[PDB]
Amino acid sequence: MIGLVGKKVGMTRIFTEDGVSIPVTVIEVEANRVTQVKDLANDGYRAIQVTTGAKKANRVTKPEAGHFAKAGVEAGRGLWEFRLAEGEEFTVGQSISVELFADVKKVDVTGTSKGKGFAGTVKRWNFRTQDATHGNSLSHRVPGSIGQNQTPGKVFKGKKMAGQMGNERVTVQSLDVVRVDAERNLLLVKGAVPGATGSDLIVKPAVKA
């Protein structure tokens, strides 16, 4: 089934009557407006392309403005696609809101993880550190050996070493839906989801069943 695009409002808890604290991530999902519909005949696959939010008209470029004009929808802050199952069809300009998840009870959330920057091998790959004392000289957090002797004579593809960590697309699967609140445009899911506060999230019904 299709999903929606939301925004990570933040994190809080829900207190249940039996005395259990549920850590919840709050995703504000406004109406998602179908901007395009793609089918086998024209595009070779079935999908619906939606937008959400709003953006100031003074920097919607003319190509984007023209694209939104065909659908007759208000310009949003981005565009995202969702593959269609065999059953559902949507129409251009249709508005999809949060009660899609009224009875889903398990969602996957995709976001862009917080960017850690150029991280070393210890933080990036859980490398053991070397001795802090006992004669160790200038090698406390360094990666150690990176290969064998002459026989390979080369470092293998995919070797774990320092580099950029974070700021990449991450999906967390099978998150419980604590509640769906239609009038406030809110989804409360149990647990933590990728990304900093105020970033875009893609919520889909759980595929892992």
Binding site: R13, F15, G19, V20, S21
Partner: protein, 122 residues
């Protein structure tokens, strides 16, 4: 968190006063023992005319840690020290007859009901 080389006070009248964790049971590379968990200990000190001697190796169940336990609502219970109850090595039943100090509800697990019954608090 109790790990190997940790010294625990003893919370029953088994004769021991100080024990040392020499293994955390139940899993390869297992690191820590919480409050419901069974460890293996050696006895570092015991009272003279007692039941168990200094040096014997046997099991124990942790009952209080000052790492503490978390309750489902987020609350924690922290003690002032680490304590265990000695169990015999084969049929893991308590060796002593009295339990000193409080315990927690993490023990109410049909296996340490004796410790629950004997404990002053919980």
């Amino acid at each position: 968190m109790i790990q190997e080389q940790t010294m625990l006070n003893v919370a029953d009248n088994s004769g021991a006063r100080r024990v040392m964790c020499i293994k955390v049971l139940g899993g390869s590379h297992r690191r820590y023992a919480g409050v419901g968990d069974i460890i293996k200990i050696t006895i570092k000190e015991a009272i003279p005319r007692g039941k168990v001697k200094k040096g014997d190796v046997l099991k124990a169940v942790v009952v209080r840690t000052k790492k503490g336990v978390r309750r489902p609502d987020g609350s924690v219970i922290r003690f002032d020290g680490n304590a265990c109850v000695l169990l015999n090595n084969n049929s893991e039943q308590p060796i002593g007859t009295r339990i000193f100090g409080p315990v927690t509800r993490e023990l109410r697990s049909e296996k340490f009901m004796k410790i629950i019954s004997l404990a002053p608090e919980v």
